[PDB]
From a paper:
These antibodies were discovered through their capacity to agglutinate human erythrocytes infected with different strains of Plasmodium falciparum, and they bind to a subset of RIFIN proteins. The antibodies show a remarkable adaptation with an intact 96 residue protein, LAIR1, inserted into the third CDR loop of the antibody heavy chain. In this study, we reveal the structure of the Fab fragment of one of these antibodies, showing how LAIR1 is presented on the antibody surface and drawing conclusions about how this class of antibody can recognize its ligand.
We expressed the two chains that make up the Fab fragment of antibody MGD21 in a secreted form from HEK293 cells. This antibody has a kappa light chain (VK1-8/JK5) and a heavy chain in which LAIR1 has been inserted into CDR H3. This identified two copies of the MGD21 Fab fragment in the asymmetric unit of the crystal. The two Fab fragments adopt the same structure with a root mean square deviation of 0.26 Å (calculated over 475 Cα atoms) suggesting a highly ordered linkage between the variable domains of the antibody and the LAIR1 insert. The structure shows LAIR1 emerging from the CDR3 loop of the heavy chain and lying across the antigen-binding surface of the variable domains of the Fab fragment. The long axis of the LAIR1 insert is positioned with the β-strands aligned approximately perpendicular to the groove between the heavy and light chain CDRs and the insertion and linkers interact with, and occlude all five of the remaining CDR loops. The N-terminal linker (linker 1) is 10 residues long and adopts a simple loop structure that joins the antibody variable domain to the N-terminus of the LAIR1 insert. The C-terminal linker (linker 2) is longer at 34 residues and is more complex in structure. It is stabilized by hydrogen bonds to the LAIR1 insert and to the antibody heavy chain as well as by a disulphide bond to C93 of the antibody light chain. Each of these five CDR loops was partly occluded by the presence of LAIR1 or the linkers (occluding 12.7% of the accessible surface area of CDR L1, 18.3% of CDR L2, 47.3% of CDR L3, 34.7% of CDR H1 and 16.0% of CDR H2).
Residue numbers in the entry:
A (entry chain A): 2 to 211
B (entry chain B): 1 to 213, 222 to 263, 271 to 351
């Protein structure tokens, strides 16, 4: 039995009333549980039997539903409520989980701070050449990175990395690395890092020559 | 309070057999609970692995059942998990958990009884089955009853199992087609009869290739009670890799505010600890999650400082790798 949670991501601010949906592919009566998982931590039972609050969970958390459609309502959000939420069917074997809904802090939009770094003289004098680009402290999460060698797009040898929402300023960061040989890197001059994000029509371009 | 502690390795060689144990505190494993295992990949959601019942019975997620073994040791108050032929896909944080038949308190004097079947509800022809009727403490008589022929069976062989519950067992040594049907429990306590339990279907499967069947096909329940995970262990991270211990290569990253960094390339295994100016610089640092660069790890860590402090003052990144016992410092010098 497939459990489909929606949306995949929801943005709200403290004090807000929000609602998360969970749909079952078949009728499952009221046999649904809600779990909460904060970043870096183990899960926690919140609601069992669709609507029953587990002992010691705040009355802000309310669960509702029967058959195929199930809802989780959190009224008057607190900082500790920004977490991942999973629904689970417990009537049939296997008792499979939903894919989760991440509840994040809706802060003001912020453009990325783009930095480009050429290979170090220590990495080069060992046969390697990594060009690193940083796309830091931007909001919302959705960003696109692109590499250009002498004005030509490059996808091979590119490795990307994304941080979780910052626990202090609520932004997001990203690191992209284009790795090649000292021989390959020494054949070209222009190295560009291009960032496309909601806060601008034109992408942010950061380049270096040599 | 109830505690569950995971124990085992951090690293497991590819095509090996992973062995984990869960140590239970403030409870007994020999109780009406389903001792379970769940796993979470590095960036994925939760996957239900399997569970072990009081009867010793086991259930495993079909996705990977062949490679799975869940056992229980009552004497040591623990349960275990074994995983054969492990691949990179078996990389995760592994949790041991307790599943319980939670009840919203509606009744207290004569609460509605429960019916269960051991080993299950789909029994092969000629084989045995036992019904377990559960009720409060102090029951004098338990009754099992059949729907289609409305036959009943009474027993005073009642036994207390917990400070709140009591039970009776009804065995059918050899099942036949005429034994299949719907069964319930009702008990007599303090000059009164309880509300009847919910029905539980018992199927007797035929001895041929052609045999086939509100749950899916054969996925019939074995209890009227719904079990819910109410306690989780804090988890144990397991990494599946054929790689060798390798220390990192630390490379400096040189360009009102300025961003500098460090590239920490080709190490095994995670983690690595990155600080800036021995922790003195902390407010503007971003250390990125590691990516898998051909069975070795790579990460970057950025620092943001005012232009007045660099290059006039030295900025150094401190990289520690506990596994290889290496601790490196790299100064960020400017470029032209
Ligand atoms: C589990 O994690 C929590 C973090 O809130 C901690 O209090 C607890 O001591 C940890 N350890 C055990 C054995 O539960």
């Amino acid at each position: 039995i497939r459990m489909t949670q929606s949306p995949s991501s929801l943005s709200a601010s403290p004090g807000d009333k929000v609602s998360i949906t969970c749909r079952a592919s078949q009728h499952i009566n009221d046999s649904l549980a809600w779990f909460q998982q904060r970043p870096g931590k183990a899960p926690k039972l919140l609601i069992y039997g669709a609507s029953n609050l587990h002992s010691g969970v705040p009355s802000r958390f309310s669960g509702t539903g029967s058959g195929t459609d199930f809802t989780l309502t959190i009224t008057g959000l607190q900082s500790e409520d920004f977490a991942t939420y999973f629904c689970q069917q417990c009537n049939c074997f296997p008792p499979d989980f939903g894919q989760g809904t991440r509840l994040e802090i809706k802060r003001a939009d912020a453009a990325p701070t783009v930095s480009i770094f050429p290979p170090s003289s220590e990495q080069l004098t060992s046969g390697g050449a990594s060009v690193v680009c940083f796309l830091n402290n931007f909001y919302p999460k959705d960003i696109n990175v692109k590499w250009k060698i002498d004005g030509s797009e490059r996808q091979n040898g590119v490795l990307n990395s994304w941080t979780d929402q910052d626990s202090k300023d609520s932004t997001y960061s990203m690191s992209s690395t284009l790795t090649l040989t000292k021989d390959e890197y020494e054949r070209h001059n222009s190295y560009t890092c291009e960032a496309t994000h909601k806060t601008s029509t034109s992408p942010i371009v950061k380049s270096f020559n040599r | 309070e109830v505690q569950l502690v995971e124990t085992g390795p951090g690293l497991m060689k590819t095509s090996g057999t992973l062995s984990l144990t869960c140590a239970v505190s403030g409870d007994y494993v020999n109780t009406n609970r389903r001792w379970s295992w769940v796993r979470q990949a590095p960036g994925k959601g939760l996957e239900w692995i399997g569970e072990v019942h009081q009867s010793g019975r086991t259930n495993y997620n079909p996705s990977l059942k062949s490679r799975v073994t869940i056992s229980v040791d009552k004497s040591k108050n623990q349960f275990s998990l074994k995983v054969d032929s492990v691949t990179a896909a078996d990389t995760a944080v592994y949790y041991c958990a307790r599943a319980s038949p939670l009840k919203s308190q509606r009744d207290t004097d004569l609460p509605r009884p429960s019916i269960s079947a051991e080993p299950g509800t789909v029994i092969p022809l000629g084989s045995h089955v036992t019904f377990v009727c559960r009720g409060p403490v102090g029951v004098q008589t338990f009754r099992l009853e059949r729907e289609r022929n409305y036959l009943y069976s009474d027993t005073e062989d009642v036994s207390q199992t917990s400070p709140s519950e009591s039970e009776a067992r009804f065995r059918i040594d050899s099942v036949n087609a005429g034994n299949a049907g719907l069964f319930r429990c009702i008990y007599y306590k303090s000059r009164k009869w309880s509300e009847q339990s919910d029905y539980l279907e018992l199927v007797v499967k035929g001895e041929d290739v052609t045999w086939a069947l509100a749950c899916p096909q054969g996925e019939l329940p074995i209890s009227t009670d719904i079990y819910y995970v109410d306690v989780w262990g804090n988890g144990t991270t397991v990494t599946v890799s054929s790689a060798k211990t390798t220390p990192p290569s630390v490379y400096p990253l040189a360009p009102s505010m300025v961003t500098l960094g460090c590239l920490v390339k080709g190490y095994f295994p995670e983690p690595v600890t990155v600080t800036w100016n021995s922790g003195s610089l902390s407010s503007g640092v971003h250390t990125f999650p590691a990516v898998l660069q051909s069975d070795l790890y790579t990460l970057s860590s950025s620092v943001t400082v005012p232009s007045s402090t660099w290059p006039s003052e030295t900025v150094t990144c401190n990289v520690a790798h506990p596994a290889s016992s290496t601790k490196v410092d790299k100064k960020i010098v400017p470029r032209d």
